[PDB]
Amino acid sequence: MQIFVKTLTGKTITLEVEPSDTIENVKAKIQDKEGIPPDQQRLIFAGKQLEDGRTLSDYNIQKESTLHLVLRLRGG
């Protein structure tokens, strides 16, 4: 299924995922395609921060949903 990940710079990335995928997996797909390290990624859907060990189905994320990506950098 296609999902959209909207970043804070107005770029939206499309990913192909399955509801059975874990949040950790999603973060790895985002690293693979845009280069952002998983440790800097904070994923938000329906006002909940997504946790690594849960699956997309846990959160009831359906096709064509949009997740928000906030970056948390280490150092500033």
Instruction: Report d(CA 45, CA 76) in Å as an integer.
Output: 26
Ranges of each domain in the chain: 1-76
Domain 1-76: state its class: alpha beta
Tokens of 72: 């948390």
Which one-letter DSSP state was computed for residue 7? E
Structure solved via:
X-ray
Question: How far separated are the first and last CA of the chain, in Å rounded?
Answer: 37
Instruction: Report d(CA 17, CA 10) in Å as an integer.
Output: 22
Count CA atoms within 13 Å of residue 48 on its CB side: 11
What was the resolution (in A) of this experimentally determined structure?
1.8
